[PDB]
Amino acid sequence: GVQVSPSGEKITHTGQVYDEKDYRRVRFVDRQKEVNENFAIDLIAQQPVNEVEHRIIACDGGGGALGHPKVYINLDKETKTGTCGYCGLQFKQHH
Template sequence: MNLKLLNAIRCNKNIFNKYFAVRYSSTVYPEDKITHTGQKWDKDDYRMARFVNNPKHVNPNIAIKLIAEVPPKKTTSRVVACDGGGGPTGHPQVFINLDKPGDHSCGYCGLRFELDQHH
């Protein structure tokens, strides 16, 4: 494709749709999968051209659902420190007050902590 056509694609998707229909008339249009953010493009959207020969890979594991499966960590201390595991995979250290009943989650990673009242 030349530079004029690329600029036309960016500015006017109708020109691209005509070009796409002529060039790839025998190609089956891909079906867009919904991402974890709810994003889904229309079938005639020009951004779908990148998925004609290759499938669109969407991760079905949503982080908030995965972290909800982890049970709260019970502790006897009224204040806990969370650094997300430390090192390059962690986050800045935050302190979480557990005085109020129930579990309390870290604002960075979502890990939950709960005060163990039995000790």
């Protein structure tokens, strides 16, 4: 989530933060640095892994035509989850 650098400036979800000696920090004086606080990397990691009965699962992201292009995920490797390349949801084969 949002952390602060030693200069006190918030660090973004892209890792951006001005140096302490960066003059461009002047632009936030008496104003503010806009930083979205809901990091997608943290929220997607909070989702539980989906357990399925097959070795191929299809993900369209939910909502049918409101999600993402339907893709098929291979679940043969038992040492890791199959992750959807669009929406980041994880799936695992039951056995």
